[PDB]
RNA sequence: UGGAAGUCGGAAUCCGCUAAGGACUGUGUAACAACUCACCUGCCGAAUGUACUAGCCCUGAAAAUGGAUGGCGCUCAAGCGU
RNA sequence: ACGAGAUUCCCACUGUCCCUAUCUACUAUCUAGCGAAACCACAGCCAAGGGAACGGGCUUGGCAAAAUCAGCGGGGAAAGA
RNA sequence: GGGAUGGCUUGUGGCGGCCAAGCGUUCAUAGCGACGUCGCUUUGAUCCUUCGAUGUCGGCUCUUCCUAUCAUACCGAAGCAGAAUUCGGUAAGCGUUGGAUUGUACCCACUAAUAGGGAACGAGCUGGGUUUAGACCGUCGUGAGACAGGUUAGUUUUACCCUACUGAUGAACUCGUCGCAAUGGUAAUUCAGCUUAGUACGAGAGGAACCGCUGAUUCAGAUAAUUGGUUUUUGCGGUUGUCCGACCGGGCAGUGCCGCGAAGCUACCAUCUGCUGGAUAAUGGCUGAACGCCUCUAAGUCAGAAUCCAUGCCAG
């Protein structure tokens, strides 16, 4: 018979399967619409996650309960290394959709770019791109001009080839993250040119976004392994020493069809899914050459946004960094993909200016309360060893 | 308000009404932390002849 | 209000009732000494003068150890002018009543010779002394007896002679929209332990009942309400609860359970003529 | 079909006002501009509808504890609302009469 | 309206359905047992439950006898299970209490004893005029 | 407001501009919505449409009809103390159905056990069970009559006085499928009852008042909820 | 209340669109777009002017 | 009838001038007024109106996993009658 | 008075529950060695029809790509059934 | 040893009598009969009339479907002034709760609302119908025993197989990097507050709505800066008993016990986020024939629902 009580469904049909991603790096299913009209510009970068930290804003909100006051917000710091633009890709149109018809990369090539072509770095005689270095001097680069000219007539997206820096974030892996980044505004003769003339240099992330904007994070989430049902999908535990398990479902099925469905809940891969969150406000555009990068105008203490002790499990951010209220998906040291949003935010507080008062430099390893090592020393005073 | 946008658009603007010695201070950030001390509970009028 | 209240009209207890009537000739509505216009049918007395006029109802008053005898014997002449009454007290040991309800029963089963036999159905309200009237008729404890209401929930033939049938009932409460919870409860039709917040209906007892009376089985004297009453007969009884704080609500019910159960002497004084 | 008949009965008689509860003022007013007579009669044949349908329901509930097929219940389901549709149709003029009076 | 403080932020609520809390007015009341809160949404098993400046219907269980057959609104005024409020601070009171009020917010008591919530100081203004201290 | 308010705003302000028109133009699509009502509504509502349509059809062709003719019986003649009048001592039902006895009786089980004893018979049809009626003790009974199928009354129709009047039942003559039946008391079809028509002034030739008079059920009382009769007169 | 795919609601947020966060994000898209312009700037045959050839089937084999 | 003039009601429903016009078909007024219908005349230009009957078509009642003229599909048929 | 007898309630008490979370040991997991049994017409994707309201084989369709591992209890199988 | 009605059903009674379009019927002038109508089934009462379990239902968890729509969206009508509604239509996108009562299905509250059903009733777990063996009472029987019955306590215990489902690998095509998107899934939901505005409307009492802004309910996807929780970090300290002669330093009491406790995991017990185009249904129209008036429809065409299909989103 029927259901006698209502109940909404234990998770969303809208993310299954819910397996392990099929790569480690996020990958941008869509980029935003192309606008001839508007100027030429870049529409994503990468990123690796740092951490998190708290912060005091003063907030303007009109018709808010905390207009005019002080709010304390969670934020999350990426670390963005500048990123080296290696390559042009072109993309035609046809009636089973986008298709790649050529791709120019950059005379030289780093090492970091050049680790990605291999699985056995140490043992390889590094031949990668070696022969293709060479079509740029024999001919005067004739057949580079002819792939750009054939990318100026016949494509009409163009997506620059572009890698992190992986070498100067405190990460043990040497082996550097390689994505498209679509040029949005302007011809497809405007879009080639802004891609040579930005071959071989690097590009910061204050060039790509800017504070106050919102933005979408795209990424791998934490994985969890095998997860029975009870945390997989949220269902309602059995009673205490029910037969053949608690943490179960109680009924896979008791109607026609003779099967199991799809829509049932089941123990499996939970985490490390592929997701992109939208909406995720810019705060805090640090430069790393900044030695008060996590000071604000009324917080005049010069210190820089690492902890004390350092980022757990992370390391020190010494590059420009990004800070987002919130939270996105991923983990420490996972490679986080930024992203322009797609359509024209509908919300005021994607047009709120953001006035922060106070970061969190405090240790995340404990309850640390000190937020420079010299409030610590003047707080504690005097110890043996400074004597010894 | 009307004429800016009504409400909960029309931002109100607190510092309009101060009354200051010099009008330039009208929207100075007044500093409040400073190596880890409270900046409002060393403020003091003879902050000069205790100095 | 609660269902506790609500119980005695239930639509299966007012069958059984139904059906001990239709299978009885002879109807013994059972009435309560203490509160004997209280205890009465009038519903079902309008119902048998109305739809089956050849059954024959008769009063038993029952529990008259607990009142007075001359009030007793009023309460006897204001109901013999309505409808043939019997004094009874329903024991198994010491019965008193009996040999003139036997013979009261011999005359209807004389003057219903023809058939083959008679059933004498018991009606009433809960713990009114059905199934003690049985017992004490029979000789031999045939039928649950408790102090509680609701003991007897369904009908049961005991063959008192081989021509007179006894059928006992559940107690039944027939619906009025002047009935209040605290008189249903001091009619006994509730159980205390179910019923919230006892303490409301002390002061109805402290009424009901004389104050000597209440001294005198308590030993206790000089409370100006019903609460210092409960307080101070927790703090005599030792029924404190932890902190030592009184039980109020437990000795409330224990008061309540005397006051239905008989240890507390009252009775409704019979109307002056 | 009882329980909506008596809802609507019910929310027909308790709406409307009660002649002897009012003001004498309200009362002689009404008792002008309608005859208080044919008010009164108007909702006594409301609520004497309402009961009956509610005694013919009862009926023939209990009849259908003792139905025995699938037949006999649907002959005494279509009886019952027969009797319903009849008892509401008797009840022409005093429906129209208090919906001017409403 | 059916009792539901508009411009509530969402905090922790530490008290549901059958709990007792202090009756923290002079209305007669001792203690105070919830019954339902107002504005609670639907979904299966979960029992409902209030904070500080929440509005709940409650019994008397103990106080003056005639407190003790209605069903009181009442506001919450003090929690024990720690909340947070916007500027970052979780806090929580030594014990759970509120006020007997009408359907619109108005005390029946006259006075109240001990603190008060901002939330509920906020939210109800004659609580905010009979408080003495507001936390 | 007060009184004939919207009647006295139409008076100072009128109605809507394009009220008239759009009232006018409405009433020339009904046709178009009719039609389409007629063959695209599904359903009981269809139906209901449908026989609706045919009632207000028939009564505008009735007034037509008494529209057109506003400017406009036995054989052999009797006079007027005979009109309206009407050997064979038979009954307006001769013939019923049969009932058996899985119809007119149903098994009741008794016992604890799975086996259960099946010797108590509960009648399914109404019946009368007479006067001054006690029920037998329940060791005893075989044939069980239940309280709610217990009919008292019946409506009988005078046949001549073409009236209906609710008499009670004073005994049943004749079921005429089984004498058990009428032994039982079940009133069904063709079942022969015995009415007090005191109410009916029926009188003897001397001033003798005839209280009891036979009457015929032609009805099927278990499917209809009452007995209904016509006098044998 | 009214979906998120209502049709007034969509038009509400076109108005907002059009009107209000347009000219922000425009702005702030020529100030990033000439911020990495800074960067950015800072025979046929033989020389590769003719788009000549690189150096299943649509059809059947034949 | 407080007011009721064809048009809130009850009962009758005639005559004249007629080409024709009901003691009136609706709108409307507190009641009138006013408009309109029935009916007549002028313009026009040749076939229409009412009710039935026989074919095909729509509806004429339907639940609950996704599905069935056998499937694709078929519209001067690849449907229906000869 | 006594009772591992049956029932209702009160205080205390608590993860019984809101509403679930975390930790430990032994398994389950992998490896070396050792190593059965139940059961078994043949085999195992569905939808509609298959008069004997049965279908896994028939008809008509959907369709359909080696070989695998951990769980699972819808169906088949499985209860000294 | 043998077994374990169904293209049914739904919204409008019966009996008896009149009336009647019609069907029949002209060498008999009978008989059926739609639409209706008439008789039987308290001046707003009474509460002093509850009328028979042989047939059995519930509950937990969880998923999906139907519409016969309770709420949300839109629309038509009503003395519908406003507010609150009532009746009806399109619509299943999205929700439809927490409790009391077993002397045996109705009450209470919250809420936008607490709509109805199917896939069982034509070997998941657990309480009654319900009933092996023990026992007691009632009725019946001379009796063993049976039952109108009532009460108590009481033995079925898979999965490692195939398929289905949930996830995880994978040969062949040299390896690897960056991509495309056929197909499959698909997501948001409702309420409140500020402003409009004490304005429209109203005799008064009362009292809206569009645009704009801010929160919250339910659902969903993440996350651990902060706050709680968790402690084999057996990290540090305290402490009971015993043992190593005492101290120091330790063992054992399966983690002796207790306090704090990073890190990790976690919680509407914490925080963040949840997005836009086209085509339509009901209806409202424009131009205009059928049909010399007329008409939203016939040709043509405009708008319009949370509907439908896609984008955003997940898999590849
Ligand atoms: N003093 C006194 N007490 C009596 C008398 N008769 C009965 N009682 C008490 O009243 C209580 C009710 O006895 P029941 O036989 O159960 O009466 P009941 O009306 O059938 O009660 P229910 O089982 O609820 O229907 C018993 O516990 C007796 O103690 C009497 O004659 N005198
Ligand atoms: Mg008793
Ligand atoms: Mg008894």
């Known amino acids: ?66 207009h005019k006051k002080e709010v304390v917000e969670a934020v999350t710091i990426i670390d963005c290394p500048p990123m080296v633009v290696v390559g042009l890709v072109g993309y035609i149109e046809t009636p089973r959709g986008l298709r790649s018809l050529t791709t120019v990369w950059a005379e030289h090539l780093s090492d970091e770019v050049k680790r990605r072509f291999y699985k056995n770095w140490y043992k390889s005689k590094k031949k990668a791109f070696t022969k293709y270095a060479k079509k740029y001097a024999e001919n005067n680069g004739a057949s580079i001009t002819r792939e750009l000219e054939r990318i100026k007539k016949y494509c009409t997206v163009v997506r620059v080839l572009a890698h992190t820096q992986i070498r100067k974030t405190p990460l043990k892996q040497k082996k550097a993250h390689l994505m498209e980044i679509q040029i949005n505004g302007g011809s497809v003769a405007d879009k080639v040119e802004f891609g040579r003339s930005l071959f071989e240099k690097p590009v910061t992330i204050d060039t790509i976004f800017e504070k106050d904007e919102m933005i979408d994070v795209i990424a791998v989430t934490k994985g969890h392994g095998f997860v029975g049902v009870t945390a997989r999908w949220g269902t309602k535990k059995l009673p205490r020493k029910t037969h053949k398990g608690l943490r179960k479902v109680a009924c896979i099925g008791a109607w026609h069809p003779s099967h199991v469905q799809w829509t049932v809940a089941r123990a499996g891969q939970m985490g490390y899914h592929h997701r992109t969150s939208v909406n995720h406000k810019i705060y805090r555009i640090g430069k790393g050459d900044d030695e008060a990068n996590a000071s604000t105008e009324t917080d005049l203490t010069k210190k820089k946004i690492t902890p004390m002790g350092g980022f757990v499990r992370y390391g020190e951010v010494n590059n420009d960094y990004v800070m987002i209220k919130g939270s996105v998906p991923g983990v420490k040291k996972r490679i986080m993909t930024l992203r322009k949003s797609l359509f024209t935010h509908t919300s005021r507080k994607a047009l709120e200016k953001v006035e922060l008062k106070w970061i969190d430099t405090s240790s995340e390893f404990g309850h640390g309360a000190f937020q420079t090592a010299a409030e610590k020393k003047q707080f504690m005073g005097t110890l043996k060893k400074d004597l010894q | 308000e009307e004429a800016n946008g009504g409400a909960g658009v029309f931002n109100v603007d607190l510092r309009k009404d101060w009354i200051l010695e010099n009008p330039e201070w009208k929207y100075d950030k007044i500093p409040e932390i400073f190596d880890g001390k409270n900046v409002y509970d060393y403020i003091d009028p003879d902050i000069d002849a205790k100095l | ?264 002497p009252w009775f409704t004084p019979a109307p002056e003529p | 079909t009882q329980e909506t008949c008596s809802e609507k009965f019910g929310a027909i008689i308790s709406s409307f006002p009660v002649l002897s509860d009012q003001h004498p003022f309200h009362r002689d007013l009404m008792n002008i501009l309608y005859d208080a007579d044919h008010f009164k009669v108007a909702l006594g044949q409301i609520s004497t509808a309402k009961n009956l349908i509610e005694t013919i329901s009862r009926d023939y509930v209990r009849l259908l504890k003792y139905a025995q097929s699938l037949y006999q219940c649907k002959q005494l389901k279509r009886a019952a609302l027969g009797r319903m549709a009849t008892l509401i149709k008797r009840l022409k003029d005093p429906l129209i009469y208090l919906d001017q009076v409403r | 309206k059916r009792g539901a403080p508009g411009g509530k932020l969402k905090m922790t609520l530490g008290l549901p359905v059958g709990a007792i809390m202090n009756c923290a007015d002079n209305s007669g009341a001792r203690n105070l047992y919830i019954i339902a809160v107002k504005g609670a949404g639907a979904r299966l098993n979960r029992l409902p439950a209030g904070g500080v400046g929440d509005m709940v219907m409650a019994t008397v269980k103990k106080g003056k006898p005639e407190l003790r057959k209605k069903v009181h609104p009442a506001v919450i005024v003090r929690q024990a299970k720690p909340w947070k409020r916007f500027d970052g601070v979780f806090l929580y009171f030594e014990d759970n209490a509120g006020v007997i009020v009408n359907p619109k917010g108005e005390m029946k008591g006259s006075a109240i004893t001990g603190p008060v919530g901002k939330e509920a100081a906020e939210l109800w203004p004659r609580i905010a005029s009979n408080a003495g201290v507001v936390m | 407001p007060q009184n004939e308010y919207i009647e006295r705003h139409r008076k100072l302000h009128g109605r809507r501009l394009d009220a008239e028109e759009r009232a006018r133009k409405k009433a020339a699509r009904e046709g178009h919505k009719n039609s389409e009502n007629a063959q695209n509504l599904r359903g009981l509502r269809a139906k209901l449409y449908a026989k609706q349509r045919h009632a207000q059809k028939i009564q505008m062709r009735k007034a037509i009809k008494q529209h057109e003719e506003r400017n406009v019986e036995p054989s052999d003649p009797i006079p007027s103390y005979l009109l309206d009048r009407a050997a064979r001592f038979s009954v307006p039902i001769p013939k019923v159905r049969g009932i058996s006895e899985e119809e007119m009786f149903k098994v009741v089980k008794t016992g604890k056990k799975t086996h259960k004893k099946g010797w108590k018979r509960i009648v399914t049809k109404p019946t009368f069970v007479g006067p001054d009626f006690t029920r037998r003790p329940v060791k005893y009974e075989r044939f069980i009559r239940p309280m709610g199928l217990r009919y008292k009354k019946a409506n009988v129709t005078h046949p001549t006085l073409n009236v209906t009047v609710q008499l009670p039942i004073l005994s049943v003559k004749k079921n005429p499928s089984n004498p058990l039946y009428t032994q039982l008391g079940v009133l069904t079809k063709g079942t022969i009852i015995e009415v007090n028509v005191s109410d009916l002034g029926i009188v003897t030739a001397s001033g003798k008042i005839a209280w009891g008079r036979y009457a015929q059920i032609t009805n099927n009382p278990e499917n209809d909820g009452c007995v209904n009769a016509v006098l044998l007169v | 209340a009214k979906s998120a795919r209502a049709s007034r609601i969509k038009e509400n947020h076109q108005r907002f669109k059009k009107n209000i966060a347009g000219p922000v994000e425009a702005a702030r898209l020529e100030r990033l777009s000439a911020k990495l312009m800074a960067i950015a700037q800072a025979s046929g045959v033989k020389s590769g002017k003719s788009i000549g050839r690189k150096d299943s089937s649509i059809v059947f084999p034949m």
């Open chain 1, 1 to 66: 018979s029927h259901r006698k009580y209502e109940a909404p469904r234990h998770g969303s049909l809208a993310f299954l399967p819910r397996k392990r991603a099929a790569r480690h790096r996020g990958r941008v299913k869509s980029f935003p619409k192309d606008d001839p009209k508007k100027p030429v510009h870049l529409t994503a970068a990468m990123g690796y996650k740092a951490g998190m930290t708290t912060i005091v804003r003063d907030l303007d909100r009109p018709g808010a309960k905390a």
């Open chain 3, 1 to 264: 209000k609660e269902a506790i209240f609500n119980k005695g009209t239930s639509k299966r207890i007012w069958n059984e009732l139904y059906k001990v009537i239709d299978s009885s000739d002879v109807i013994l509505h059972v009435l309560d000494a203490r509160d004997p216009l209280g205890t009465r049918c009038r519903h079902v007395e309008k119902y048998l003068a109305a739809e089956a006029p050849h059954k024959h109802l008769v009063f038993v008053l029952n529990k008259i150890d607990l009142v007075p005898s001359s009030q007793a014997a009023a309460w006897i002449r204001i109901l013999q002018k309505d409808h043939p009454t019997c004094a009874m007290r329903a024991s198994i040991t010491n019965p008193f009543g009996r040999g003139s309800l036997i013979d009261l029963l011999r005359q209807f089963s004389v003057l219903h010779k023809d058939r083959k036999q008679i059933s004498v159905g018991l009606i009433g309200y809960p713990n009114v002394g059905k199934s003690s009237i049985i017992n004490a008729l029979r000789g031999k404890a045939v039928a649950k007896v408790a102090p509680i209401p609701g003991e007897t929930k369904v009908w049961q033939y005991v063959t008192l002679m081989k021509r007179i049938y006894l059928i006992d009932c559940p107690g039944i409460v027939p619906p009025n929209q002047h009935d209040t919870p605290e008189d249903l409860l001091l009619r006994g039709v509730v159980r205390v332990e179910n019923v919230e917040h006892p303490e409301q209906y002390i002061p109805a007892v402290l009424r009901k009942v004389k104050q000597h009376h209440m001294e005198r089985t308590y030993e206790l004297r000089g409370w100006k309400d019903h609460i210092e009453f409960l307080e101070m007969l927790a703090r005599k009884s030792g029924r404190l609860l932890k902190g030592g704080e009184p039980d109020v609500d437990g000795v409330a019910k224990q008061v309540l359970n005397d006051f239905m159960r008989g240890k507390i």
